[PDB]
Amino acid sequence: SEITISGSTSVARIMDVLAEKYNQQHPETYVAVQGVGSTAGISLLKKGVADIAMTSRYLTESEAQNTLHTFTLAFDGLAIVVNQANPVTNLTREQLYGIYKGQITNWKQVGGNDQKIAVVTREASSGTRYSFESLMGLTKTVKDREVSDVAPTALVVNSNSMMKTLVNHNTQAVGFISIGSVDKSVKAIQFEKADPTSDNIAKHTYQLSRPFLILHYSDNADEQTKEFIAFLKSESAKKLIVEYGYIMP
Ligand SMILES: [Mg+2]
């Protein structure tokens, strides 16, 4: 048989591994992992042409359906990173928002050196960028969509790796990376005085995290779907999730 799980390209990175694992033990069921973004995934499931959707954000009021079931597969965290030389140890929500908006333009304003801030972001198509902006309220409504509201003087880089190298080489820069990509080349700072840790994400004391949700019709689903959903809830799956740097609720 065939199971189609659609949506989030953020979730698809780990789902590709989970699926290949489940296929080893169930060689006659192909799990098609379709990375089309959280919103297309929801639509595909509601049209009955996916069995499962995956998202990297909570559902809106309008997306919620009474017979749709949701569970949280994992949390994925973001770190704010500065150059090792930067004395700043913490930013609040309003400070970071203000910096990304271009309202706060010198580090002295947020307890640092007298030096112009270089704001660094990711490419337009980046999932990590979309979640950072959603978490920080850095989009704006324009007619029928959200548009990025980050000051267009921000510099764009195209990976975690390149973000860290940029930060590492520029005392003035601030940026964001997946929490798992943190290494000693950059200084990860607190957000609202909470350290960027697995434990703080799991307890929601650290705010900069996003859910990986799994959506399906628990009632009206066929057995192959129920069996894959069970596996996603199994220790064998969780072990894999954790080992790739995602965080158990
Ligand atoms: Mg806004």
Q: Are residues 106 and 183 in the same domain?
A: yes
Q: How many CB atoms lie within 10 A of CB 34?
A: 21
Compute, in angstroms, the gap from residue 140 CA to the centroid of ligand 1: 5
Q: Are residues 169 and 224 in the same domain?
A: no
The single-letter code of the amino acid at 197 is T
Q: Are residues 97 and 53 in the same domain?
A: no
Q: Are residues 6 and 93 in the same domain?
A: no
SS3 sequence, 79-137?
Answer: EEEECCCCCCCEECHHHHHHHHHCCCCEHHHHCCCCCECEEEEECCCCHHHHHHHHHHC
Q: Of 23, 218, 60, 66, nearest to 134 (Cα)?
A: 60
Per the CB < 8 A criterion, the answer to whether 193 and 205 are in contact is no
H or E, element range at 40: helix 38-46
Q: Are residues 132 and 234 in the same domain?
A: no
**Which of 143-149's residues contact partners 24+ apart within 8 Å by CB, and which partners?**
148/124, 149/101
Compute, in angstroms, the gap from residue 51 CA to the centroid of ligand 1: 34
Q: Are residues 111 and 69 in the same domain?
A: no
Q: How many CB atoms lie within 10 A of CB 84?
A: 12
Distances (CA, A) of 82 to 156, 193, 199, 212: 16, 15, 22, 27
Q: Are residues 124 and 13 in the same domain?
A: no
> b/e for 71-80, b at 16 or more Cβ within 10 A?
eebbbbbbbb
Q: Are residues 83 and 205 in the same domain?
A: yes
- Return the structure tokens found at 194: 């909470």
Compute, in angstroms, the gap from residue 148 CA to the centroid of ligand 1: 8
Rounded-to-integer distance, Cα 21 and Cα 15, Å: 10
Q: Which residues make beta-bridge pairs with 247?
A: 75
**Residue recorded with tokens 């947020």:** 110
Half-sphere exposure of 51 (CA within 13 A, CB side): 18
- Return the structure tokens found at 242: 């954790």
Rounded-to-integer distance, Cα 69 and Cα 25, Å: 26
Compute, in angstroms, the gap from residue 38 CA to the centroid of ligand 1: 20
Compute, in angstroms, the gap from residue 67 CA to the centroid of ligand 1: 31
Compute, in angstroms, the gap from residue 95 CA to the centroid of ligand 1: 14
Per the CB < 8 A criterion, the answer to whether 190 and 93 are in contact is no
Compute, in angstroms, the gap from residue 9 CA to the centroid of ligand 1: 24
Q: Of 131, 150, 155, nearest to 140 (Cα)?
A: 150
Provide the residue range defining the domain that includes 199: 77-210
Compute, in angstroms, the gap from residue 37 CA to the centroid of ligand 1: 21
Compute, in angstroms, the gap from residue 209 CA to the centroid of ligand 1: 18
Q: Are residues 178 and 198 in the same domain?
A: yes
Q: Of 78, 31, 37, nearest to 190 (Cα)?
A: 78
Per the CB < 8 A criterion, the answer to whether 237 and 229 are in contact is no
First-to-last alpha carbon distance for the chain, in angstroms, is 31
Q: How many CB atoms lie within 10 A of CB 97?
A: 17
Q: Are residues 66 and 167 in the same domain?
A: no
Compute, in angstroms, the gap from residue 217 CA to the centroid of ligand 1: 33
Compute, in angstroms, the gap from residue 149 CA to the centroid of ligand 1: 7
The dihedral through the CA atoms of 231, 233, 238, 244 has a sign that is: positive
Which of residues 210, 225, 240 is at a domain's end? 210
Compute, in angstroms, the gap from residue 144 CA to the centroid of ligand 1: 14
The count of structural domains within the chain is: 2
Q: Are residues 21 and 112 in the same domain?
A: no
Between strands 69-82 and 187-191, the pairing is: antiparallel
What CATH number does the domain containing 131 carry? 3.40.190.10
Q: Are residues 155 and 92 in the same domain?
A: yes
The single-letter code of the amino acid at 211 is P
